[PDB]
């Protein structure tokens, strides 16, 4: 029966490829030929945040565009007030191997996790001023990767065990498991309507998942190596993903095809983080060359370069108001650019 | 009225900074070690003499060491291992005792040695279960490493007075096979510290202590252009 199933799978893949080819009437690079370029984009480091002792692995903006949470390999989370550069909280962690961290959209909770396969949720709204662990989620069989709050009562996590999970924080139980990846799942991105999310893996592929049903709605491919970062286009109709190929790709959910490739002949290093500006016209990508390049989403031309970190740029983030871009690195510093 | 909020924020920042200074001193006073090998190698026996990740703490001559044993992680280790680019050394345990396990260990060592984010860390190499290789060779290397047919024990070898030469030359052949990888690169930024050991011993802690001493001393000597 195995040979018949293999042949059927090949036939279905050919049918899907033909269906995708049927829609390739024109490229984005042709439609956008009549769109004025963004010009030269320049940014300056507006704030530098110090206090971490080791690599900064994760960073996430608050919904008020003023607080930051960052996680370092010292075993600490730091909550900063970006307008004053003062630290608001410092949270010691049970284990120092933290790969992800997340800020709740309500500002009440902070999540983190990493090589201990456990996602810890801390309650910031503490009556005593002492931040305590509000819960631990311990259902994964591999190192924990990007995690994102869906609301105060639900969190979506990904891990190295090839699965994703929707957890109910109130009971500490998994309410949905999303399976179908074969490699480690590296990054999550939630849709602006929090009904779908997109997950990239070490299969050189990404999957669009339906939160409520638990099914995989769409599979996108086109990268040559592992996908390290993924984000949603502001209107929710596209992804931008970065991989170890030293390339970034914009995918369209309705056409079910790769829409644009951002790459350069002089870039042979991988991409660590990807984010969009408020309007979606500027695509920001952090690279292992210790630098972050700014791209023009519509015209795929390099616009500007952010320089200053002296080690690999681990994380990148843009505020909900779009006012500033925060960048983290392995040199233990955060930078807030205009 | 915002002046009072600013003052309170400054006070909280000052408290956080004091705690961070204490934590910085404690962090800088500790050496972190990565332990690799969780197969036929007697890693658990070494750990006993010394959940995604387990931690073991020990002290040698009032120097604190923090060793990290890898727990529930998949066979794919390309992305995970990048978390350990700041350890002082990697402790690699290979059993010298059915597939070519030694070739697999050599390939993993070669991968770790040449990784962009790991090619500054020295490797302390434990060649474990020397007695099972001693038993086997005295009653299978030539069928996996044909060049061993032409290997001769070297001039600086220090075998035990009761060791059969057939065991000495095999142990030193394996050690030289690891050193052949370690010596081909690094430009002096990292070195390998091979050791022979039994599954159960008491000198492992002292040997790790001395290897860390040599690693840090060599790093400092490199800094001052004295080496």
């Amino acid at each position, epitope marked *: 029966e195995l040979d018949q199933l293999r042949q059927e799978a090949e036939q279905l893949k050919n049918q899907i490829r033909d269906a995708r080819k049927a829609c390739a009437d024109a490229t984005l690079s042709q439609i956008t030929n009549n769109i004025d370029p963004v010009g030269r984009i320049q940014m300056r480091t507006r704030r530098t945040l110090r206090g971490h002792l080791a690599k900064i692995y994760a960073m996430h903006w608050g919904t008020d565009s003023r607080l930051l949470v960052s996680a370092s390999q010292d075993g600490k989370l730091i909550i900063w007030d970006s307008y004053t550069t003062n630290k608001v909280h410092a949270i010691p962690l049970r284990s120092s191997w933290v790969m992800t961290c997340a800020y709740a959209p309500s500002g009440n909770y902070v999540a983190c996790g990493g090589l201990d396969n456990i996602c810890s949720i801390y309650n910031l709204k503490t009556r005593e001023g002492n931040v305590r662990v509000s819960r631990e989620l311990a259902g994964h069989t591999g190192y924990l990767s990007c995690c994102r709050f869906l609301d105060d009562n639900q969190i979506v996590t990904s891990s190295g065990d090839t699965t994703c999970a929707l957890w109910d924080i109130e009971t500490g139980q998994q309410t949905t498991t999303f399976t179908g990846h074969t490699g480690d799942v590296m990054s999550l991105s939630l849709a602006p309507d929090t009904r779908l999310f997109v997950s990239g893996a070490c299969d*050189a592929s990404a999957k669009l998942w339906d939160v409520r049903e638990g099914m995989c709605r769409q599979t996108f491919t086109g990268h040559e*190596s592992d996908i390290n970062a993924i984000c949603f286009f502001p209107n929710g109709n596209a992804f931008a993903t970065g991989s*170890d190929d030293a390339t970034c790709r914009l995918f369209d959910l309705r056409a079910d095809q790769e829409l644009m490739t951002y790459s350069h002949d002089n870039i042979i290093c*991988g991409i660590t983080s990807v984010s969009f500006s408020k309007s979606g016209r500027l695509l920001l990508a952090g690279y292992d060359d210790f630098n972050c390049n700014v791209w023009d989403a519509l015209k795929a031309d390099r616009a500007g370069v952010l320089a200053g970190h002296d080690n690999r740029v681990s994380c990148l983030g843009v505020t909900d108001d779009g006012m500033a871009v925060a960048t983290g690195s392995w040199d233990s510093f955060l930078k807030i650019w205009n | 009225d915002q002046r009072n909020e600013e003052k309170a924020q400054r006070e909280a920042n000052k408290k956080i900074e004091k705690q961070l200074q204490k934590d910085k001193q404690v962090y800088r006073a500790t050496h972190r070690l990565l332990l690799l090998g969780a197969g036929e190698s007697g890693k658990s026996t070494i750990v006993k003499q010394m959940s995604g990740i387990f931690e073991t703490k020990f002290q040698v001559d009032k120097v604190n060491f923090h060793m990290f044993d890898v727990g529930a992680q998949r066979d794919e280790r390309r992305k995970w*291992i990048q978390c350990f680019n700041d350890v002082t050394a990697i402790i690699f345990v290979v059993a010298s005792s059915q597939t070519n396990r030694l070739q*697999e260990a050599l390939n993993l060592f070669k*991968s770790i040695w040449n*990784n962009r984010w790991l090619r500054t860390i020295s490797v302390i190499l434990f060649l474990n279960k020397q007695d099972l290789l001693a038993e086997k060779v005295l009653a299978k290397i030539e069928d996996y490493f*044909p060049e061993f047919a032409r290997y001769t024990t070297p001039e600086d070898a220090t075998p035990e007075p009761g060791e059969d030469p057939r065991v000495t030359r095999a142990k030193y052949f394996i050690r030289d096979e690891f050193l052949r990888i370690s010596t081909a690169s690094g430009d002096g930024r990292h070195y390998c510290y091979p050791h022979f050991t039994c599954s159960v011993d008491t000198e492992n802690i002292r040997r790790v202590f001395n290897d860390c001493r040599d690693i840090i001393q060599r790093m400092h000597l490199r800094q001052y252009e004295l080496l």
Partner: nanobody, 126 residues
Framework: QVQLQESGGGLVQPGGSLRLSCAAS????????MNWVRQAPGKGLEWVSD????????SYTGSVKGRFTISRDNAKNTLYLQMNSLKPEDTAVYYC?????????????????????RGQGTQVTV
């Protein structure tokens, strides 16, 4: 989409030759170090040989040294393995594997259980 396809095999006699081929589709071939890895029935996966990006550095296993020849053609986008003077212990499923990162010398997850950057392999029975 990265996809590798193997070709060759069949029932062979001990002491004969066999040419295994590996065709690539979905990536640039001349940037990745290439691997040949076998798996015997009843045993796990074991690494046989590798050839570098430009084809300069060629390395083998000691059990297969002097009897196997790994080559690559970056222009024709293919990977060849010549198998002369065979042995009855060499009956295995052969895979052509790709290292995940371009422009590097290290390859971590080539000889692993669930790896997605290699083909389905071919049966070589002596």
């Amino acid at each position: 989409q990265v996809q590798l396809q193997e070709s060759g095999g069949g029932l062979v006699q001990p002491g004969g030759s066999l040419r295994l081929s590996c065709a690539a589709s979905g990536f640039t071939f001349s940037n990745y170090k290439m691997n040949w890895v076998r798996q015997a029935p009843g045993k796990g996966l074991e690494w046989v040989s590798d050839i570098s990006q430009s084809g300069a550095s060629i390395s083998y296993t000691g059990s297969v040294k002097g009897r196997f020849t790994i080559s690559r053609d970056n222009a024709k986008n293919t990977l060849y393995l010549q198998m002369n003077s065979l042995k009855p212990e060499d009956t295995a499923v052969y895979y052509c594997a790709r290292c995940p990162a371009p422009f590097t010398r290290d390859c971590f997850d080539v000889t692993s259980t669930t790896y997605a950057y290699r083909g389905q392999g071919t049966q070589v029975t002596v």
